[PDB]
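ASSEMBLY PREDICTION REQUEST
Request ID: AP-0331
Submitted by: J.K., bench scientist
Number of chains: two
Total residues: 208
Priority: normal
Notes: Please return the full assembly, not individual chains.
Input sequences:
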Amino acid sequence: SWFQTDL
Amino acid sequence: AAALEGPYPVEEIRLPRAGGPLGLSIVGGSDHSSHPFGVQEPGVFISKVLPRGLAARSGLRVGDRILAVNGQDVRDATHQEAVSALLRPCLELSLLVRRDPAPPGLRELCIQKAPGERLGISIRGGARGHAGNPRDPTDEGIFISKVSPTGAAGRDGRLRVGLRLLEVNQQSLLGLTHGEAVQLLRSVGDTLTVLVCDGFE
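STATUS: Completed
Returned structure:
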């Protein structure tokens, strides 16, 4: 969540 | 920058910017732990490529190490320095990536639980917990520690001791504590979709 970012 | 003649070849991939999302996800950054991506060599990694979106069509693959974003070196960039660089307005998105392999045994599991049936597993590790990986005490990942033979996971057969857990019902487990990971696995409902890869034996 804070460590995987979806773009 | 060379950054050439490494273990894996590099390549500049151009993504068009004509509206819409990249369809990719990144983990890592110098301020983060990016296990199981680049265990010896930290950096920014493509952790997820949406099928079959912009990133997929462009040739980007899960495991790709991002070296540069539009000419900007990001090998030492923090997670947010990398994110902002990928979000900055540009005519075209140029990504210098290194073709590092995806973590071994990477696969998604869909596990069905009958109503009233429990999962029957326990996990170890987590951020700021006790080392869940006997081979590596710097690793703060989540691993399967026990599997009950009669539980849902046991009857499914695919979850086993040693596997690293990466995400649960589309929710990433990276940087999460043991307890935070446990509450995710408990509130999962009738169907457990879990992303795993090999961890230890």
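REVIEWER COMMENTS: The two ends of chain B are 39 Å apart (CA to CA).
SIGN-OFF: pending second reviewer
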